[PDB]
Design a protein around this nucleic acid. Structure first.
Lengths: 453, 1326
DNA sequence: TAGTACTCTGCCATCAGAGCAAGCACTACGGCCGATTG
DNA sequence: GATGGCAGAGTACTA
RNA sequence: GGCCGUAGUGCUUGCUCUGAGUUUUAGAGCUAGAAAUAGCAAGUUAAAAUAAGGCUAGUCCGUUAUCAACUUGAAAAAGUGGCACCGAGUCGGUGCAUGCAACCAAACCACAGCGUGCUCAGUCUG
DNA sequence: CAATCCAGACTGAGCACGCTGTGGTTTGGTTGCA
């Protein structure tokens, strides 16, 4: 029923999008710059047929118009991680080095989910189709982007410039972010209760009750409809407790992990080459926030990653592999950090590997927020156990800052090394400033912690 | 990259090389092959040798150039005479000179009458009957007073002018003084008349026989003095006699003149010398001096004239006519005697031109000596031939007028005859009277040796400058040629430049500025000590000036006592003085200043500063010029400065010698900071008193910068120019250049990485001259050993005979006489023992009856023998039979003999190279190899250059059984280079303290260390050295007797060594200089363009520069068809320029048609061709080849041959003969190897069969003789031109490959200087 | 049979002087040059 | 001094 | 050992000269013989050339030194060629040669701290 | 009085080699999402 009410907001009915608020944008160039013409790189016959339907439909919408320009870049298809859609990418390698640089303002995935509060339990994830094509491109900068496409059936051979922001351009993610943010900035004011999360094109709406989400979704759809942006209706979770956003499951206000992601990590067999072991590490590392003490757990496999070495899968390496496989089977539910309340961090350090958990208050219990683990630098590796904990806290406290958004937090450790920093038995002065800043960090009552935590 | 070393050995005609690694192993790598053959790669060992023809000096070229100039000048003299005579010759006989020019012409070619003088047969026969010889006509012209034919007058004058005579005697000669005894009596009469105090009588003394004796002039003077009572040598009469006979006597003792007063009668300065002597002593002695001059003229004339001159004014012509008449009379008498006594040999004696005799003497080519040798037995075996035999013994039998002994005739005799002819004939012909002076000038004009060629800027040998541009003739030579400037240029173009200042010429040695510089340099490095002084002072500038002005300018030589008394005591007022740093007498002194002080007598002028240029000009003139005339003409500008007497004294005074420092360096350059010259700095430099070396090496001063700027200016020349400027033999210079090139090629080959060390070594290196030396010695000593038994030059070539003849047939150690017939029974003992040094020259070899007479054999001969025969050795030295060095070595016992320090030095210099040529080679190699500097501009020794003597390698070979035989092949050069590298590297690794004396960059204890320097190679010395050697203080292994000897043996047995013969384009003479008679052949070469060889004769055997491979078509047969031909053509030296100018036209002229410029290939000598089965041939010429393969005989066979042949002659020798006897069966294997190699390569079937037959017939001879003769057999299988050898009695001639047809389808190989880079061109495709 | 045409063998090659000047390279001789020990 | 030129005697193949 | 001085020897370069030697021509060969041939007579000297020759035209220069092949250059000159091992009859064989963020590893540059060897100056000792 | 016979140590400067800490470029890898 959502599609019928807002024909101007859904991509399946609203047609092509066009930002009716942002003005045409001129793509600037460096002072010492000259046009460069590069012939279209060879492309396989299977990859050529992938883009061909897109060119036919892109021509009808007016995005691609024939032109004669001295700039020319080789087109290149990039297939989606799924199926063989073969999305079109301009491959502006030379233009990127020639175009000017602007300060990026895109949000990093670590900090988006930190803004989501556990109070807002109802979600509505909307993803905008053909996001980068919404913004219009000034005809002055249109000759900058071009490519050679000759099809005898079409009957037109030559360059086809883009009237909108192309894909594969280095400034496209930044330019689309700012443009969308200004349009939705007016929406945020009108609805103080709603929490809007923006990731390039993906939008997430957080509300308190079911009725609040329903009212907010209609307002968001109406707002985006006038602005010209079109949201895909095939994949749009609306008024559902279970939503998928940023690759993370969101249920009961907890940052779960998708069951499919866990299957991929365990599904791979025992690695036999450094390339095979490298592939497995990254999957585990993306889940590192759920596995407690992941740095020490995957410690044996790290020295095998080196390009210059012999791949000897010894019993110790197999023990490290089994630990990661079993840990991901029973990965806990990381909670959404609440910025209003203060944070709590447990720190522990055994055998030169720092481990810990960032937790927050949940009733009478503590709920984990993110599991932090790191490898101590070799300079601190040789330190005595009393001094090693001081270095471990400093390393972990740096990691906690990237998730706590600078909010004050409490560092809890078994030992009482918090007084040791004041009177230790260059770097130490740097450590003193980080750990003694009462505004951002403090030490609570000294107490031990469970090994699992 | 791998560390390696390069070993070299340099010879006069061979430069071996070898590259080794750190383990003394020769590497090996694959080398690409270019060209068009199927082969694309080849493997070669990095060891070989380069062979080339020895270099030559420019002496022959200089002699040829001088001969050409002499012939040109003679023709110019004839042309001048003809130009003088032409105006009247036109009236007398117009075509006389034209007929004279075409005498060398056949009857058909002549454009005038064949008779050259008169033009008709009647007059020709009449003239030749009246005057059988030119001397008859000359005497008739001199004597007769009537009118004479102008043609005859010109003929006589032309003969006299063309053949003048030697210019040895300067001054003037009057032939009217002929008798010797009468003139001696007249001189004695003058002597008695003048010196009437004591009588002088020579009655009953054979003065003529004494003075005319063939003995030495000194011997004749001694005989005349002895046979004259009342006076002795060095008296007034003795000095007069010595001056007359030619010796130069000092007349100071005769008159207490206190000067040299030395007169030489033949010299041109005798006039001025006698003038000053007579001015000093009085005019009464002028008669005595004139009598002495006349006696000298008579003595020198009587040797050649031998005829009275009271009836004729042409003594030489009269003597020639007398010789003609005696020849006629003796010929008639001999003819009659032969016809009567012995008619069986008249035909062969007087008709056969092939054999000697009168026919071969006159018509044939037999000489006077050969004629005498042939006719002596015939004359002896006859009757009534006593006078003929006497004449033959006196060498006056049947003598032609023109003989080889006519070289003693001075030009003054011809001048006198010509003057007499002109005086007689000037009445009838006025032009002869008008041109007498110029004709005499034509006869007696010669270009001075300092003027040189009279070029006009198109000659590299000329230095003469002209004050005018007109043509130079003998009648305006003085008015055109600048004689003084020409002489100055002649001396200056050869003198050396300053080594520190190359740009400027060096100063004269006796220059006043040079003397001042040396005096101040010696003075500034002295320190005086007196009472009350804490530290010595340096005698600062004021004291130095006072000392110079009060000591050197007043006394010739300065002594320490005079320095202390005349200055320190008199002026400094310090009684106690202690000088330091100088000897008793100073070395340098103002020698020139004192000489001028006693002549110019002007101390103010000598001390004044503005005349230093004048003084330098005076000393420069005195040093430069040798002739009094040029000295006087140069000092004419200074005539105003000094009066005539002083000017004459300055002309008389003459200096010799040139210095080593330039005037610019000494005084011209000034320091930038204060504008002070080196001389001023020496005069006063603060209180440091620095000398010349300190001054030029001081960093603070700008002298070093100025010297470096001048030295850099001009830049080092090319490597070829450097080697040419080096001093040494041309063969050694060629070897050095080749060695540098092979070093560069090896560096390029080995990955362009320089070696760690370079080891080099160079070898150290007449009958008529011996005959002339022994003749001079015998004449000086007055002995008659040569008269007792004459000895030919070939006989004198024997060393024992030469020693016996030099020793005057007497023992050198005892006062006994040896027997010539009893030779080959005594022993020759060196003056210095052979163990101490290596020298086999005559200067060190002495022949004695018993070698035990010297006493101890380990030192100089005994003091008793030295004392016994010192007088005899001194007499021999004065007789020039022995040298000063030989005398000093012989008489060393009296001086002290050979001291232990001398023995140590002798044994040290044997193992260490000290030659300047080797030092220059090492310097060149070091400069080329190392060119990178350090942070302080100091050169980094990237490569070390080591120089060794051949003794180390020879001892290594002898000790460790690496015997070398030079007759096997040419691999011994490469083996020597490899062994040199190995030994040098091992030595520098074992002893790092010896880098100073080997690498370019106590007495008893020093003796035994140098003697046992090569002991670390040995195992059992009974001391047992460890098997593994170590450097000491380092963990470096320098030798390993377990395996390093095996490695050396393996390297020496490799069958592959890159032997390369350097291809050279032949240059030099066009052909053989002999002129053959006319014959019908195409091989003769015309001597002139218009002279047909078939009618005039010509040369033959042209020298081929380089062969050319030409593919063209020639016409063969009456059909004149074009047959394609490929052949080698020899481009001789004469036609090389014509071939280069137009090869197409040159080839087409020879008969070839449709030649191919692309297919034309230039082939120099020694071009290598590979035919089949490894058979190589080298192109000897256009139609000859040479062997081009080397036999790689096994080292076992080489060692057996050495041991059996006893090369270079108790228990150690005992086992060698036993080893040879055990290995007797090696001779058959060696013969089999020679035979198989010959069958595969040499391909001399008849010679091989003869050699095998001789070896089979001589199988019963002892092994020693058999091996010694088998060594000769390797001449059959050698590299190079075929040569004839001998096996016992049997002799084997050459097998010459006189065909070059087979090499036109072989493979032509172009080899680089090392042979590792090749370009194989297959000629079958062409 | 006449006429070229290539191969092998022995003979044969310009030689003697006289002066001058400059330079280098090596070999002996005389004289030095210090300090320490017997 | 030694090595290449040259004349002459000798033998061989083809028009 | 070093220096200074000298006496000698050898060698190199350059210049000015001399005597020969060689080649062609001139120096009428006679007689008896058809011709070859034979018998006698005569012999000593001179002219010209002495590297062909060249242009620069001089009373000049012309035999020393230098020179594997190919490419680029007028020329002077500059460039052109893989390594190791086992063997040895003139060398052979085998083998190799798109954008964003953070974290981990190799290597690179720069700086600070510690240990250790080489070069220069000074001092002392021996 | 006459004849014969430089090395080491320490101090100062330039390095040069090995190890540790920071900064920075670039290459591999890792995911994420575009």
């Amino acid at each position: 029923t959502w599609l019928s009410d807002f024909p101007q907001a859904w991509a399946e009915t609203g047609g092509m999008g066009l930002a009716v608020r942002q003005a045409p944008l001129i793509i600037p160039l460096k002072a010492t710059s000259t046009p460069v013409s590069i012939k279209q790189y060879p492309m396989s016959q299977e990859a050529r047929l992938g883009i061909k339907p897109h060119i036919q439909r892109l021509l009808d919408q007016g995005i691609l118009v024939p032109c004669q320009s001295p700039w020319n870049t080789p087109l290149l298809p990039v297939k989606k991680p799924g199926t063989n859609d073969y999305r079109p990418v301009q491959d502006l390698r030379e233009v990127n080095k020639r175009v000017e640089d602007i300060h990026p303002t895109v949000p990093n995935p670590y900090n988006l989910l930190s803004g989501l509060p556990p109070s807002h339990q109802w979600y509505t994830v909307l993803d905008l189709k053909d996001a980068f094509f919404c913004l219009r491109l000034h005809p002055t900068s249109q000759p900058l982007f071009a490519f050679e496409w000759r099809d005898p059936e079409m009957g037109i051979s030559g360059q086809l410039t883009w009237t909108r922001l192309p894909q594969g351009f280095k400034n496209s993610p930044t330019l689309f972010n700012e443009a969308l943010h200004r349009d939705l900035a007016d929406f945020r004011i009108q609805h103080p209760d709603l929490i809007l999360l923006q990731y390039v094109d993906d939008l997430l709406l957080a509300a308190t009750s079911e009725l609040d989400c329903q009212q907010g979704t209609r307002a968001l759809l109406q707002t985006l409809g006038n602005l010209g942006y079109r949201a895909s209706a095939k994949k749009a979770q609306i008024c559902q407790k279970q939503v998928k956003y940023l690759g993370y499951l969101l249920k009961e206000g907890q940052r779960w992990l998708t069951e499919a992601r866990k299957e991929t990590v365990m599904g791979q067999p025992t690695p036999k080459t450094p390339r095979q072991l490298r592939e497995f590490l990254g999957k585990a590392g993306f889940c590192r926030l759920f596995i407690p003490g992941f740095a020490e757990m995957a410690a044996p496999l790290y020295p095998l990653t080196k390009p210059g070495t012999l791949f000897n899968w010894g019993p110790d390496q197999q023990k490290a592999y089994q630990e990661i496989k079993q840990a991901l089977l029973t990965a806990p539910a990381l909670g959404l950090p609440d910025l209003t309340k203060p944070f709590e961090l447990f720190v522990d350090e055994k055998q030169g590997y720092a481990k810990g958990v960032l937790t927050q208050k949940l009733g009478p219990w503590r709920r984990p927020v993110a599991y932090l683990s790191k490898k101590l630098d070799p300079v601190a590796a040789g330190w005595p156990p009393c001094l090693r904990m001081v270095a471990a806290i400093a390393v972990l406290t740096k990691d906690a800052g990237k998730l706590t958004m600078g909010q004050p937090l409490v560092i809890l450790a078994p030992h009482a090394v918090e007084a040791l920093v004041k009177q230790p038995p260059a770097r130490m002065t740097h450590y003193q400033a980080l750990l003694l800043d009462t505004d951002r960090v403090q030490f609570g009552p000294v107490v031990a912690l469970n090994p699992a935590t | 990259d791998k560390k390696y070393s390069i070993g070299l050995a340099i010879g006069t005609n061979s430069v071996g090389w070898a590259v080794i690694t750190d383990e003394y192993k020769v590497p090996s790598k694959k080398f690409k092959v270019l060209g068009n053959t199927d082969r694309h790669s080849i493997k070669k060992n990095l060891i070989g040798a380069l062979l080339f023809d020895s270099g030559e000096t420019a002496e022959a070229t200089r002699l040829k150039r001088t001969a050409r100039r002499r012939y040109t000048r003679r023709k110019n003299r004839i042309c001048y005479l003809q130009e003088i005579f032409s105006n009247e010759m036109a009236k007398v006989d117009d075509s006389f000179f034209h007929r004279l020019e075409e005498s060398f012409l056949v009857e058909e070619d002549k454009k005038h009458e064949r008779h050259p003088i008169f033009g008709n047969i009647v007059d020709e026969v009449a003239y030749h009957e009246k005057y059988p010889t030119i001397y008859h006509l000359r005497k008739k012209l001199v004597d007769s007073t009537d009118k004479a034919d102008l043609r005859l007058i010109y003929l006589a004058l032309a003969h006299m002018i063309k053949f003048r005579g030697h210019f040895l005697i300067e001054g003037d000669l009057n032939p009217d003084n002929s008798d010797v005894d009468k003139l001696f009596i007249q001189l004695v009469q003058t002597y008695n008349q003048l010196f009437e105090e004591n009588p002088i009588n020579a009655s009953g003394v054979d003065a003529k026989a004494i003075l005319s004796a063939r003995l030495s002039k000194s011997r004749r003077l001694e005989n005349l003095i002895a046979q004259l009572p009342g006076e002795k040598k060095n008296g007034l009469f003795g000095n007069l006699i010595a001056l007359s006979l030619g010796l130069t006597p000092n007349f100071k003792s005769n008159f207490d003149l206190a000067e040299d007063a030395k007169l030489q009668l033949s010299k041109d300065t005798y006039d001025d010398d006698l003038d000053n002597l007579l001015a000093q002593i009085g005019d009464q002695y002028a008669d005595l001096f004139l009598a002495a001059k006349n006696l000298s003229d008579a003595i020198l004339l009587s040797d050649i004239l031998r005829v009275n001159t009271e009836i004729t004014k042409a003594p030489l012509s009269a003597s020639m006519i007398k010789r003609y008449d005696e020849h006629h009379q003796d010929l008639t008498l001999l003819k009659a005697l032969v016809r009567q006594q012995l008619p069986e040999k008249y035909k062969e004696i007087f008709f056969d031109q092939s054999k000697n005799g009168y026919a071969g003497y006159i018509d044939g080519g037999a000489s006077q000596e050969e004629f005498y040798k042939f006719i002596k037995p015939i004359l002896e075996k006859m009757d009534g031939t006593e006078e003929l035999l006497v004449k033959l013994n006196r060498e006056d039998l049947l003598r032609k007028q023109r003989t080889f002994d006519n070289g003693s005739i001075p030009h003054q005799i011809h001048l006198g005859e010509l003057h007499a002819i002109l005086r007689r004939q000037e009445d009838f012909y006025p032009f002869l009277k008008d041109n007498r002076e110029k004709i005499e000038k034509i006869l007696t004009f010669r270009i001075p040796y300092y003027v040189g060629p009279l070029a006009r800027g198109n000659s590299r040998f000329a230095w003469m400058t002209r004050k005018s541009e007109e043509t130079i003739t003998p009648w305006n030579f003085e008015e055109v040629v600048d004689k003084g400037a020409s002489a100055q240029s002649f001396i200056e173009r050869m003198t050396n430049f300053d080594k520190n200042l190359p740009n400027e010429k060096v100063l004269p040695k006796h220059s006043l500025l040079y003397e001042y510089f040396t005096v101040y340099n010696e003075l500034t490095k002295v320190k005086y000590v007196t009472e009350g002084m804490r530290k010595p002072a340096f005698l600062s500038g004021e004291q130095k000036k006072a000392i110079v002005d009060l000591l050197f300018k007043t006394n010739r030589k300065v002594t320490v006592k005079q320095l202390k008394e005349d200055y320190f005591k008199k002026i400094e007022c310090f009684d106690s003085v202690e000088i330091s740093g100088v000897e008793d007498r100073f070395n340098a002194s103002l020698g020139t200043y004192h000489d001028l002080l006693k002549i110019i007598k002007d101390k103010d002028f000598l001390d004044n500063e503005e005349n230093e240029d004048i003084l330098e000009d005076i000393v420069l003139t005195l040093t430069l010029f040798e002739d009094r005339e040029m000295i006087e003409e140069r000092l004419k500008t200074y005539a105003h400065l000094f009066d005539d007497k002083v000017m004459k004294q300055l002309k008389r005074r003459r200096y010799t010698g040139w210095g080593r420092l330039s005037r610019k360096l000494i005084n011209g350059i000034r320091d930038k900071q204060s504008g002070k010259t080196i001389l001023d700095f020496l005069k006063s430099d603060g209180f440091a008193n620095r000398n010349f070396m300190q001054l030029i090496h001081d960093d603070s001063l700008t002298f070093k910068e100025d010297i470096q700027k001048a030295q850099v200016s001009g830049q080092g020349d090319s490597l070829h120019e450097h080697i040419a400027n080096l001093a040494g033999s041309p063969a050694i210079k060629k070897g050095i250049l080749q060695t540098v090139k092979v070093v560069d090629e090896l560096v390029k080959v080995m990955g362009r990485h320089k070696p760690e060390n370079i080891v080099i070594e160079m070898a150290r290196e007449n009958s008529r001259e011996r005959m002339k030396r022994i003749e001079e010695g015998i004449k000086e000593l007055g002995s008659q050993i040569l008269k007792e038994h004459p000895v030919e030059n070939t006989q004198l070539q024997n060393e024992k005979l030469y020693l016996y003849y030099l020793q005057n047939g007497r023992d050198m150690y005892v006062d006994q006489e040896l027997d010539i017939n009893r030779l080959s029974d005594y022993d020759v003992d060196a003056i210095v023992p052979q163990s101490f040094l290596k020298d086999d020259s005559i200067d060190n070899k002495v022949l004695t009856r018993s070698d035990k007479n010297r006493g101890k054999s380990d030192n100089v001969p005994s003091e008793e023998v030295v004392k016994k025969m010192k007088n005899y050795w001194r007499q021999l030295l004065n007789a020039k039979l022995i040298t000063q060095r030989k005398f000093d070595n012989l008489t060393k016992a009296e001086r002290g003999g050979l001291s232990e320090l001398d023995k140590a030095g002798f044994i040290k210099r044997q193992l260490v190279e000290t030659r300047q040529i080797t030092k220059h080679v090492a310097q060149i190699l070091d400069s080329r190899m190392n060119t990178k500097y350090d942070e302080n501009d100091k050169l980094i020794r990237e490569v070390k250059v080591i120089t060794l003597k051949s003794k180390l390698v020879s001892d290594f070979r002898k000790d460790f059984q690496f015997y070398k035989v030079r007759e096997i092949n040419n691999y011994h050069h490469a083996h020597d280079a490899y062994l040199n590298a190995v030994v040098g590297t091992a030595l520098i690794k074992k002893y790092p303290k010896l880098e100073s004396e080997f690498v370019y960059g106590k007495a008893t204890a020093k003796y035994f260390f140098y003697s046992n320097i090569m002991n670390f190679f040995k195992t059992e010395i009974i001391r047992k050295r460890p098997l593994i050697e170590t450097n000491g203080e380092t963990g470096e292994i320098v030798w390993d007797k377990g395996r390093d000897f095996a490695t050396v043996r393996k390297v020496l047995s490799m069958p592959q060594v890159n032997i390369v013969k350097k291809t050279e384009v032949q240059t030099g003479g066009f052909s053989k200089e002999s002129i053959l008679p006319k014959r019908n052949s195409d091989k003769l070469i015309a001597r002139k363009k218009d002279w047909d060889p078939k009618k005039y004769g010509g040369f033959d055997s042209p020298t081929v520069a380089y062969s050319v491979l030409v593919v063209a078509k020639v016409e063969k047969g009456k059909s004149k068809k074009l047959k394609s031909v490929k052949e080698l053509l020899g481009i001789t030296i004469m036609e090389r320029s014509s071939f280069e100018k137009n090869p197409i036209d040159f080839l087409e002229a020879k008969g070839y048609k449709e030649v191919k410029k692309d297919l034309i290939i230039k082939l120099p000598k020694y071009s290598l061709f590979e035919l089949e089965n490894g058979r190589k041939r080298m192109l000897a010429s256009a139609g000859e080849l040479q062997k081009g393969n080397e036999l790689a005989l096994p080292s076992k066979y080489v060692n057996f041959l050495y041991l059996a042949s006893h090369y270079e002659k108790p228990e150690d020798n005992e086992q060698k003969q036993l080893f040879v006897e055990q290995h007797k069966h090696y001779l058959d294997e060696i013969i089999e190897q020679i035979s198989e190699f010959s069958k595969r390569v040499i391909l001399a079937d008849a010679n091989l069969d003869k050699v095998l037959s001789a070896y089979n017939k001589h199988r019963d001879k002892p092994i020693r003789e058999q091996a010694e003769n088998i060594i000769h057999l390797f001449t059959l299988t050698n590299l190079g031109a075929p040569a004839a050898f001998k096996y016992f009695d049997t002799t084997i001639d050459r097998k010459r490959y006189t065909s070059t047809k087979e090499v036109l389808d072989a493979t032509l190989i172009h080899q680089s200087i090392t042979g590792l880079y090749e370009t194989r061109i297959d000629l079958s495709q062409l």
